Design a protein around this ligand. Sequence first.
Ligand code: ANP
Ligand code: MG
Length: 298
Amino acid sequence: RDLDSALLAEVKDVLIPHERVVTHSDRVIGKGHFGVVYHGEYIDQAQNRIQCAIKSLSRITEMQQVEAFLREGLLMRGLNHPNVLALIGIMLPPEGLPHVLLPYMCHGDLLQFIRSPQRNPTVKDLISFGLQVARGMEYLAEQKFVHRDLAARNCMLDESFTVKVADFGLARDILDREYYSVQQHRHARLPVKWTALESLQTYRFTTKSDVWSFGVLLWELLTRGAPPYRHIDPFDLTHFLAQGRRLPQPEYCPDSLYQVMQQCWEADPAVRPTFRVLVGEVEQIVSALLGDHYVQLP
Ligand SMILES: Nc1ncnc2c1ncn2[C@@H]1O[C@H](COP(=O)(O)OP(=O)(O)NP(=O)(O)O)[C@@H](O)[C@H]1O
Ligand SMILES: [Mg+2]
């Protein structure tokens, strides 16, 4: 189960040798759809030791998929934006699965931030976070990356509460259909309810299906973390959306933003706006707000 020397050379700029990395397998941060995240440490190029997070991927086993992942890793390694979480690199233990090294984000994820009873976010605070997500997504789209798993939980917060979009480059067209399937009814996975109607049908994802996901993300923000479509069996979800029903306008969501959400969820992907346009629209909404309300927990 070893890589071709040629591959190893091709993807050298993203591989970190296992002997430059410690995974604290007893310091588990949490487990998700696509692997387990641990505290860890690696040695940089200056020979300094850096604390980080390390995610061992559970769904990448076949060698063709491992190779595909590393080549995609090499692309991601070159991504650089304030609102996008850096990929430090990838590590292959001699026998075992690909590990992704990520900057440790000390303030956790947006979903937990907004759900914290110890905080009192305003509407304007919440839309401002949304704008930061839009900016990260605009950059990813420009770089020809489709997230496939965009949601408030995958927007991380650093020491200065800068939002970093994370966990792109993991889910794939077709291969990961299990996480997007509705045939398990109330055993279906979280991503179903963030996924564009057409992608529920085909397991093919585009930037326009990410735009749909972003609409649901905005709805999360302005409900401070309500579960989308709480009372709908996922089995009925495609039918609900095909009738043209959508998430309802949150109590303190301005009409201008609800309109953007509605654009994001147009049934025709071509009609949905680009992230570039969303950035502009959301920026305009922020600047044109009148007054400000606290927002309650759901
Ligand atoms: N770079 C990071 N720094 C700190 N915590 C992180 C980092 N990446 C992930 N986590 C946390 O690790 C836990 C597991 O992450 P993950 O496996 O991505 O699950 P998820 O975000 O809940 N779902 P998903 O990403 O859709 O599969 C979550 O509490 C994350 O917030
Ligand atoms: Mg995640």
